[PDB]
Design a protein around this nucleic acid. Sequence first.
RNA 1: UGGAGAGUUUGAUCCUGGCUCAGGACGAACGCUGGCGGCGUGCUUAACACAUGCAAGUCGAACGGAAAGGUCUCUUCGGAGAUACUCGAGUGGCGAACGGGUGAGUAACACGUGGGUGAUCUGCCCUGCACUUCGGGAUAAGCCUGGGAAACUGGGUCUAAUACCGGAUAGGACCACGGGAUGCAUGUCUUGUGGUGGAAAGCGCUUUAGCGGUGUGGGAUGAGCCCGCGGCCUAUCAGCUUGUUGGUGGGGUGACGGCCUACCAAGGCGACGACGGGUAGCCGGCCUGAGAGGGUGUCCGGCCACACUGGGACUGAGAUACGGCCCAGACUCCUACGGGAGGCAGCAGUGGGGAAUAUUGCACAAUGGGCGCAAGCCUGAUGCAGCGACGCCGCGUGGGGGAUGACGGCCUUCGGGUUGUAAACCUCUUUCACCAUCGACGAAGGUCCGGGUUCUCUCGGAUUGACGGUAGGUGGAGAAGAAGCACCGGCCAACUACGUGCCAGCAGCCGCGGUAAUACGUAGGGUGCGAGCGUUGUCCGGAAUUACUGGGCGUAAAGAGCUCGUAGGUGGUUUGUCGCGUUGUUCGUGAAAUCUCACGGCUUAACUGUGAGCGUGCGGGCGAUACGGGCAGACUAGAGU
Lengths: 200, 82, 91
Amino acid sequence: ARYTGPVTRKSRRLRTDLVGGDQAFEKRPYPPGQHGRARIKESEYLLQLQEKQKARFTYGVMEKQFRRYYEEAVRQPGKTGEELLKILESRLDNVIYRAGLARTRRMARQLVSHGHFNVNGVHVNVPSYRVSQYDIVDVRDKSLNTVPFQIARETAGERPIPSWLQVVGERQRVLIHQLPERAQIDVPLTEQLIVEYYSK
Amino acid sequence: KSQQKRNRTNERARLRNKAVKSSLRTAVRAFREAAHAGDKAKAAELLASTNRKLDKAASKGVIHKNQAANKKSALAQALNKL
Amino acid sequence: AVKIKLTRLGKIRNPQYRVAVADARTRRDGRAIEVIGRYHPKEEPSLIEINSERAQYWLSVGAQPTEPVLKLLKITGDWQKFKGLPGAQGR
RNA sequence: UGGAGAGUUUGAUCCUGGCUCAGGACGAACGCUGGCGGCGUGCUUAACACAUGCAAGUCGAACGGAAAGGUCUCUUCGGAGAUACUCGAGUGGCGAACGGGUGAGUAACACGUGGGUGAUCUGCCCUGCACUUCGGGAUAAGCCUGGGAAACUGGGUCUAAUACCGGAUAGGACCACGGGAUGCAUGUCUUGUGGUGGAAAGCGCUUUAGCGGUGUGGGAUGAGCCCGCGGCCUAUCAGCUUGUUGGUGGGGUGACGGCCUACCAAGGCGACGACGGGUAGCCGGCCUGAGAGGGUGUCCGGCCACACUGGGACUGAGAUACGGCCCAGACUCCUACGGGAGGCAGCAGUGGGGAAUAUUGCACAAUGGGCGCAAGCCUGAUGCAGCGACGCCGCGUGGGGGAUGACGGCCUUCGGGUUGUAAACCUCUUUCACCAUCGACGAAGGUCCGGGUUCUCUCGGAUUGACGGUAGGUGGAGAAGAAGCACCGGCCAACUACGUGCCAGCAGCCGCGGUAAUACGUAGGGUGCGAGCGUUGUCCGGAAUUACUGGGCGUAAAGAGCUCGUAGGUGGUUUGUCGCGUUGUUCGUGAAAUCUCACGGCUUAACUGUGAGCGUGCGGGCGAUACGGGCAGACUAGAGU
Ligand SMILES: [Mg+2]
Ligand SMILES: [Mg+2]
Ligand SMILES: [Mg+2]
Ligand SMILES: [Mg+2]
Ligand SMILES: [Mg+2]
Ligand SMILES: [Mg+2]
Ligand SMILES: [Mg+2]
Ligand SMILES: [Mg+2]
Ligand SMILES: [Mg+2]
Ligand SMILES: [Mg+2]
Ligand SMILES: [Mg+2]
Ligand SMILES: [Mg+2]
Ligand SMILES: [Mg+2]
Ligand SMILES: [Mg+2]
Ligand SMILES: [Mg+2]
Ligand SMILES: [Mg+2]
Ligand SMILES: [Mg+2]
Ligand SMILES: [Mg+2]
Ligand SMILES: [Mg+2]
Ligand SMILES: [Mg+2]
Ligand SMILES: [Mg+2]
Ligand SMILES: [Mg+2]
Ligand SMILES: [Mg+2]
Ligand SMILES: [Mg+2]
Ligand SMILES: [Mg+2]
Ligand SMILES: [Mg+2]
Ligand SMILES: [Mg+2]
Ligand SMILES: [Mg+2]
Ligand SMILES: [Mg+2]
Ligand SMILES: [Mg+2]
Ligand SMILES: [Mg+2]
Ligand SMILES: [Mg+2]
Ligand SMILES: [Mg+2]
Ligand SMILES: [Mg+2]
Ligand SMILES: [Mg+2]
Ligand SMILES: [Mg+2]
Ligand SMILES: [Mg+2]
Ligand SMILES: [Mg+2]
Ligand SMILES: [Mg+2]
Ligand SMILES: [Mg+2]
Ligand SMILES: [Mg+2]
Ligand SMILES: [Mg+2]
Ligand SMILES: [Mg+2]
Ligand SMILES: [Mg+2]
Ligand SMILES: [Mg+2]
Ligand SMILES: [Mg+2]
Ligand SMILES: [Mg+2]
Ligand SMILES: [Mg+2]
Ligand SMILES: [Mg+2]
Ligand SMILES: [Mg+2]
Ligand SMILES: [Mg+2]
Ligand SMILES: [Mg+2]
Ligand SMILES: [Mg+2]
Ligand SMILES: [Mg+2]
Ligand SMILES: [Mg+2]
């Protein structure tokens, strides 16, 4: 399933904005509800809970799938938080967002869902597809010249391109030099609280 | 079902095997009587005839070769001890 | 007797096969005496490797291959090597 | 490479110590809700009783034959002709002991692991060496009859065989005497002489169609039997045993053996739990856990046991002989009352029990299996499909802008706040569903035709897929067809209003409700999760509350009233040796799957393949001798005189 709900409420509860763009701010404080102005007790469970919430709603992942991503990360050699970030970052729709082909995360997800991309000449339409090192991502050649994809053809200058993927000329294609390192790539969160949440 | 054919052939085989084994048993008891008498004269060829019959039964497949050999050894030693 | 057969150990629609030396009085996916190869009927023609000396050992000692296994042995040339025929490789 | 705590005994405190909760899991059930796909999974209770259909046949290249089809065939003009492909019934071979089901029994060499078999067997298959030689009498079937209600059965004639029987020759049969090797006591293996013995089967041929048969040496395979070690509760079960323990001679077996028998001796097992009672199929594994442990044995795989209940044998290479035979018993049915028939713990299905578990489906296309020279024929194995959110995984119910703070709801200190960029509206894309269309891989295969003579090889041709006109691809219009469930006092994220007023009710704990309830019911709001969400049941965790890792006994539960002493456990200093413990290394084994790490393939994932780990162990060889232990000594410090 998908959330498909007001994103501003979900940012206002977690006290952090996760969207940016044209609807970057709601131009008002953060009382997320009717009692949203209350100065409430701050438990230790709450910090871990809301950090994992930020991690999930940054990417639109569902709890059952994030849980599996957690076992993958903790079971991977190395560390845990950076591996969790790397796994959550290698998602193909996230790659589409970070390669400057998307206004937001939701619409990048919809473009991946509607099958507007081919990786090794393979038509993929699963958002949770995981990209890999030396993967090329190609837009479906019969899908270009369409308005929401060509509106991102000329607006490829403002949001920076990270240093693990790469975009090329008018044929908008993506090359992955190596797997990312999200800890040095745009963390609006601390990965050390997800680990503590998944220990109780 | 058509195992009735097997049912009939099993009965025929049972009759043949029964007849053969009974004949060997009579031969063996006759030799035992001869050895108990101990004349050593007629037993000397009753042993040959009985061993021949045991071998023939083993070749016919009514008994097993090892059983035939066991009985032949026992009877030959019984003769030698008399 | 002793057979060289194909045991289906893939999934519901991808019939992977192992080339196993098994006694005939054994279920298809039973305990094999010795696995000596594999056969995948889904690749470019297909995927086929046989040990080619354990295969020779079993053929020499008396195992009778089933008919698809005979086809694979003819493809790989082990059957021709064993019987004494010219073409020892035909893939 | 992995370990979290919280509430509750008191006016308060610190300990001790129970109880309870937060996690995970399920072959699940129930409540509300419910879009799709992929891959799994589905009688846990009555091993209760079963209507119906199907689950084991095949060979005419073994045989006599001619019920059926096709024939050249005569001719009846509706009947003829085994000579003739072909073939119902029948004799004969092989198969039917596998495959499939269930877990009742079983505490046992049943299972797991490692050995032994000089104590054994093994159809078909591979392979070496020999041979395949003479005869003879019947009967099935047919035909004529008899008995019986049936189920079946008696007689007379009549005919074969690779059916049956008797001979000749043939060493791995036997007896006696010897040699040569080896050892682990019986012995084993190989040889020499003498004396006794033991088989066979033929059929076919478009002309190098081809199938066969018997004795033996050696392989492979499968199996039997014996042993070490390992895995439940119970002493409020303490005496069990007379073929019992052992021996000798016989018998029996494929094989050792009290396996059996006659005789002889008087032993055997037991506190390291005999005998008895309860429960239970065992394991690879599965769940949990930081680990050690605990629970469990369901899908899948291996082994065992059983087939209405109890007993027995026959045939055979091989029998718990599920769809074989005999007997007894219970049950259901037929009967002419004399007598007969049956066995879903095979697939599907019915009743019943139950909280609860599926279609009387398709195909032999693929793999495995049986018979056949082969084509072929059989296969409810198997390959798939149907049904059930029963489970795991994946994807949808849109996206980009937009304070009318729309409208309304609710709260308000009546000022405003909230739902809330959320809607309206503008615009964009159509994953899945819908419509139309093309259409698979699984098949380097199976068949007949051509080079190739055959064997082997392509060649090309038809033709062959249950799944399936499915997956998938392509195209069309449209935000278009698609969200719910639980909770919000603390644990534990999430708060107010109204109604109610120890009532109605809630509750895992302790508690909440007797007139201003964040704990009852509704509303608004919020939180978690999401095609699911809650409850119940069960297991582990938390629980260091059975403590090996890893706890205790002055007063919290806990030192026997005290001593002596049996088995047992433990043991001072020192020398030598052994190498049992211990430790090093190597070989074998520890099946596959599952698990971990890395890739590879399904659009991803679940799932699947490959490689390495793991498999803690056990057995064999070869090293070490510090410590433990054994064996042979020494010493006086402990102990005693
Ligand atoms: Mg027959
Ligand atoms: Mg008599
Ligand atoms: Mg004897
Ligand atoms: Mg008190
Ligand atoms: Mg006090
Ligand atoms: Mg406590
Ligand atoms: Mg049952
Ligand atoms: Mg016939
Ligand atoms: Mg035959
Ligand atoms: Mg048989
Ligand atoms: Mg059976
Ligand atoms: Mg059982
Ligand atoms: Mg054992
Ligand atoms: Mg007659
Ligand atoms: Mg002779
Ligand atoms: Mg003869
Ligand atoms: Mg006695
Ligand atoms: Mg005796
Ligand atoms: Mg039981
Ligand atoms: Mg623990
Ligand atoms: Mg029984
Ligand atoms: Mg029954
Ligand atoms: Mg019985
Ligand atoms: Mg046989
Ligand atoms: Mg027999
Ligand atoms: Mg029986
Ligand atoms: Mg039965
Ligand atoms: Mg049956
Ligand atoms: Mg049977
Ligand atoms: Mg059934
Ligand atoms: Mg009920
Ligand atoms: Mg009922
Ligand atoms: Mg088939
Ligand atoms: Mg077949
Ligand atoms: Mg339900
Ligand atoms: Mg809270
Ligand atoms: Mg009130
Ligand atoms: Mg309430
Ligand atoms: Mg899901
Ligand atoms: Mg507990
Ligand atoms: Mg514990
Ligand atoms: Mg302790
Ligand atoms: Mg204590
Ligand atoms: Mg003490
Ligand atoms: Mg006291
Ligand atoms: Mg006390
Ligand atoms: Mg005292
Ligand atoms: Mg003592
Ligand atoms: Mg002592
Ligand atoms: Mg001692
Ligand atoms: Mg000492
Ligand atoms: Mg393994
Ligand atoms: Mg891949
Ligand atoms: Mg060793
Ligand atoms: Mg002294």
